Amino acid sequence: PCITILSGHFPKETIYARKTKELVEEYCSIHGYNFYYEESEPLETEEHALHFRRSWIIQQAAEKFPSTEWFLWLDSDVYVNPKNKNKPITSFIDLSDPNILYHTFHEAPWGSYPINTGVKFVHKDALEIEKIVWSLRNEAPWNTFPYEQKTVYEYVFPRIPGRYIVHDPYTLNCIVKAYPEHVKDALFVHMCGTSRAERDEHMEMV
Numbered sequence: 300p301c302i303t304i305l306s307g308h309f310p311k312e313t314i315y316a317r318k319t320k321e322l323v324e325e326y327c328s329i330h331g332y333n334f335y336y337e338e339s340e341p342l343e344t345e346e347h348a349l350h351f352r353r354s355w356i357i358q359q360a361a362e363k364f365p366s367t368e369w370f371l372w373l374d375s376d377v378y379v380n381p382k383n384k385n386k387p388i389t390s391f392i393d394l395s396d397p398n399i400l401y402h403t404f405h406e407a408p409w410g411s412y413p414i415n416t417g418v419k420f421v422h423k424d425a426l427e428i429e430k431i432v433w434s435l436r437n438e439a440p441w442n443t444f445p446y447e448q449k450t451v452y453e454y455v456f457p458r459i460p461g462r463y464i465v466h467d468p469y470t471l472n473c474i475v476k477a478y479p480e481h482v483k484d485a486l487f488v489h490m491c492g493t494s495r496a497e498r499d500e501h502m503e504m505v
């Protein structure tokens with residue numbers, strides 16, 4: 300399928316995010332995926348609004364790449380494992396069921412929520428849903444942690460029974476501290492919960 304990977308970060312001075320951007324862009328070039336990257340400074344800078352911004356950036360990606368079938372959001376703290384950069388996304392996940400609108404990933408047993416949306420596949424037919432997710436950013440309880448992640452799991456999922464899958468995260472949302480043993484074989488490696496300087500240091504070793 301036509302896949303558009305999207306992400307974003309501000310400011311440009313944040314080195315780890317420059318590096319993850321580079322690796323994602325390279326990965327897209329290898330497999331012919333579209334790549335959308337939001338470099339603008341957010342107008343709403345509170346923690347909740349920052350987390351929700353992915354559901355606004357997806358519309359940017361849809362406008363730029365109208366032929367997209369699958370949108371793939373990656374946090375700026377996610378990168379493509381160099382060992383696996385020559386392998387397409389479809390070698391790791393089956394996107395053939397026409398009924399699915401979201402592919403998401405758990406973070407068990409080490410995490411704190413049933414899904415981790417640092418990596419999130421959204422079908423083109425869920426763009427109007429993402430518009431709703433964005434609209435909920437300033438309404439309780441969706442404006443409370445974990446924000447868009449809670450909104451997807453607790454607002455969206457109940458309303459689309461059978462049209463989402465929660466997958467093991469070992470290859471596609473491979474949280475570094477939680478699944479160190481799987482990092483080597485992952486496609487998407489997720490530097491979740493760590494500081495900027497810690498991320499800079501990790502990326503230097505990549």
Ligand SMILES: [Mn+2]
Binds near residue numbers: 374377
């Ligand atoms: Mn993250």
